[PDB]
Amino acid sequence: SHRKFSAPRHGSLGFLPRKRSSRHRGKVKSFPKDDPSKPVHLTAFLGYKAGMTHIVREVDRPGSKVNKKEVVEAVTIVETPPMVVVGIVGYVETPRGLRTFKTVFAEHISDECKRRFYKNWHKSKKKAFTKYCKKWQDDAGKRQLDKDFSSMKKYCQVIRVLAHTQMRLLPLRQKKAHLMEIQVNGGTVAEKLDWARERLEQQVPVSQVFGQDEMIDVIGVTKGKGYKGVTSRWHTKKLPRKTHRGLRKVACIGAWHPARVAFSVARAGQKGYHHRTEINKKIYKIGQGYLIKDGKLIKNNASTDYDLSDKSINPLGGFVHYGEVTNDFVMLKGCVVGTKKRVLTLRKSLLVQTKRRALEKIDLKFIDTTSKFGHGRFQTVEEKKAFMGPLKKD
C-alpha cells in the first residue's frame, strides 16, 4: 500500500559510497577549462586549515537593509606558505582518455620533498633520485632531456606542474611535504612549457596564483566521526520511547517482494572522513607573512586601514590545536571542510560568474584577534595589560 503521508527522503544518493576516503589530500577531479587567449597561470594551490574568526565589514549592495551598514562574518584562516615547483608532467588525449606522456624532474629536490617517496625515512638510506639527478650535469643527459622537452612540446596537450608544499615553515609535527600536479592554463603548449621550465625548482607564492575578492573552490576531507548509527549518519526520525529493541534505528528496511535490501535504504556505518568539493568560497584577504625589515619584524598582517593597530592574525595564545601562523595566509568567508591543521586544496572557479555576490568588492574594517581558548576578552596583550594594570607576578 502507498504511504499515507509523503516526505522527502533522508540524505542524498549523490554521495552514495559513504566510505572512508582512499586519500588524505584533496584531489582536483576537474581543472578549469583551458583557452589559449589568457596568459599562463596556475590553477590550484595547497594550504592548511588554521582556525576561524570574525570580520566586521561594510556591505555594498543596493536593495537590502545591510546596504551602507556593517556586519560581522565568520572567516576561516588557511596558511599557505609558497610552493616549490619540482617538475612538469605532460598529457596527451587518446580515444581511451587522457594518458600521461612524460614527466621531467628538477635537478635539486629538497629532502622534505623526498620524504614523500619513503614510508620510513629513518631506516631508509635516502637514495631517491640520486642516479636521476646525474642527467643534468652531463652532455649526454642534457641532450637526453632537451629532445624530451621538444617531444612534449610537439605531442602533449595538457601540461601540469608537479609542485610540493614547504612544511619546514609550518608549526606541525609532520615534515613530509605534500605534492600535487597543478595544471597550467594559458597560451599554446610551447610557451606553456617554456614558462614552467624556468619556474622549475623555484618559489610560487599564493599572491600570484589567487587574487582578492575572488570566488574559489575548496577540496578536502571531512572530519572523521567513525562508526555511527543510522540516526546520526542519515538523520532519520528517532523511534518512540516504547520501542523494544532500541529506538535509534530505522523501523522498516524495505518491502517484501523486492526481496533484498536496496542500496537506497539508510544503514549504519562510517561517518565523516569523506572527500568533498565545496564551490564559491570568497577570498577576503591574502595576508602577508612575517618578514624582517631592517632589524625589527613586520607583524601587523591583521591591521586594517580602519583599525591601525599592530596585531597579527594570530589570536591570543595562538590558534587552538594548530599553532601560530607566520606565513602568508588566505582568509575565506564562512566555514570550510576538514579539521584543524588539515591540508586543503584551493581551486579556481570552474564557472564564469556574473553576479552581485561574486563581483562584490570587500573592504574589511576589523579582524577579530581575541582568544579562542575560552571566552576571549581582549584583542591584544598590550590592551589587556593596560586594562588590568600591574599584577602580583611582577
Binding site: 560581522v72 577579530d368 581575541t370 571566552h375 581582549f378
Partner: protein, 63 residues
Amino acid sequence: MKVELCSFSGYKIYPGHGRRYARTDGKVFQFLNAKCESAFLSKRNPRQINWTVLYRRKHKKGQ
C-alpha cells in the same frame, strides 16, 4: 563598530561577542557572557562581586 560596555561586569564588548537583553519596560542591557548574564538575572549586586570593575572602583583598588 560601536565598542560598548557590559551592563553587569563593566568590561569592553566587541562586535562579535556578547548578548543583548530587552526587558518588558525598555531598559536594554548588555552582557559579556553567560556568567555575567546569569549573575544579573539572579539579581546579584555587582558591588559585592570581586572581579567586577564596579567592585574595584568602589574599593579603590588599582590606580
